Structures are given as structure tokens and as C-alpha cells.
Design a protein around this nucleic acid. Structure first.
Lengths: 100, 104
RNA sequence: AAAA
């Protein structure tokens, strides 16, 4: 109720975008229901929210080919590469254009 | 462009980074990661992009836990393989730990 | 709290 996920399918990743309605407390990490994804595709995590929410979510998709964190300045920065891409690679995605 | 300060405690290693100027994602290919005592959890702290924080949290996932410093709260546990649970907050004040300047 |  403080938080909601939009899950968008793309060829090479699933986009997971969160929207925080009101300021969250860390106790929420114990209660959050994470979106299920196609585990054969990497994940791009997007949203305006605390660094600890991002780190929590990135860890929760570590079992996928890669995890990329959305930077509105750049695209999605690969922060974990298990089976695909390299850390520091940028995926050319504009999340604002998908959501608008 | 970015340097590390390693602060050894009994309960955790505090890794604090400092950025001299804006970094580019390419830096993640070049960064040398401080080695830690892997039998103690890690607290990550610093002023930098969310992707840097996520990159560092994953690089210390082989330790008992990874906590991310929030100046409003303390160190929020984002990963645990210890008594600590995700969403637990470690009472640290990094601003006070760093007073007087730490060599990076 | 998308460069705590």
C-alpha cells in the first residue's frame, strides 16, 4: 500500500519499476512481495526510492542472468553479471518514455 | 575519481567511498574492491549513484550480511546469512565515525 | 529517496 510494482517484458530483460506513494520504513523489506520474473532473462530495476530498497531488490534477482539499475541520466547500469553482459555496461532504456 | 576508507569493527567492516568528480559506469570494470574479513558483515556508505551502491553490495554478498548506510536511520540490512534479518537497522552514525577525516 |  506504501509501494507498487510495474512489470514490463522486453526481449533481453524484465523491467521492474516501483512507485512509492508515501515514505517507507526498512521494516517493509520483511513484508514486500517481489514480482516473479522469467529467470532466463536479466532484470532492470527502476524507481525513486532509498538506496537500501534498490540493493534489497538487486539481491532478490541475483539468480537471473544479470541485474541492471536504472539511472535516468544514462540507461540501466549492469551491477551484477552472472551469465550475460559485464558490470559497468549500460542498457539503452528510457523508462520515463515507457511509463509516459 | 573514487577512493575507499576501510573501518574495522568487531561487528562489521565499514566500507566508505568518496567520489572526487562525477563517475561513469565504465568505472565498475576498473574499481579495486577492498578485501575484508569475510567472517564479518559489511556496511557500505558513501555519496554516489545507486548503481555503485548496488555493485558494491553484490561484491560483499559472500560475507554474513550487507547493510547500506542511510543518514536518517543507520545501516539498513539488505542481505543476511546471519542472525540479522533484511530490514533490521544497525545503529551507526558514519558522519560521527568520519569526524577529523579518514585516509581513503 | 534513482549522486545516501
Amino acid at each position: 500500500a506504501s509501494m507498487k510494482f510495474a512489470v514490463i517484458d522486453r526481449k533481453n530483460f524484465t523491467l521492474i519499476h516501483f512507485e512509492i506513494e508515501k515514505p517507507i520504513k526498512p521494516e517493509i523489506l520483511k513484508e514486500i512481495e517481489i514480482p516473479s520474473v522469467d529467470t532466463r532473462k536479466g532484470v532492470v530495476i527502476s524507481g525513486r526510492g532509498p538506496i537500501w530498497l534498490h540493493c534489497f531488490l538487486a539481491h532478490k534477482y541475483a539468480h537471473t542472468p544479470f541485474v541492471a539499475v536504472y539511472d535516468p541520466r544514462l540507461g540501466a547500469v549492469v551491477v551484477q553479471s552472472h551469465s550475460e553482459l559485464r558490470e559497468g555496461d549500460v542498457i539503452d532504456v528510457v523508462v520515463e518514455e515507457i511509463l509516459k
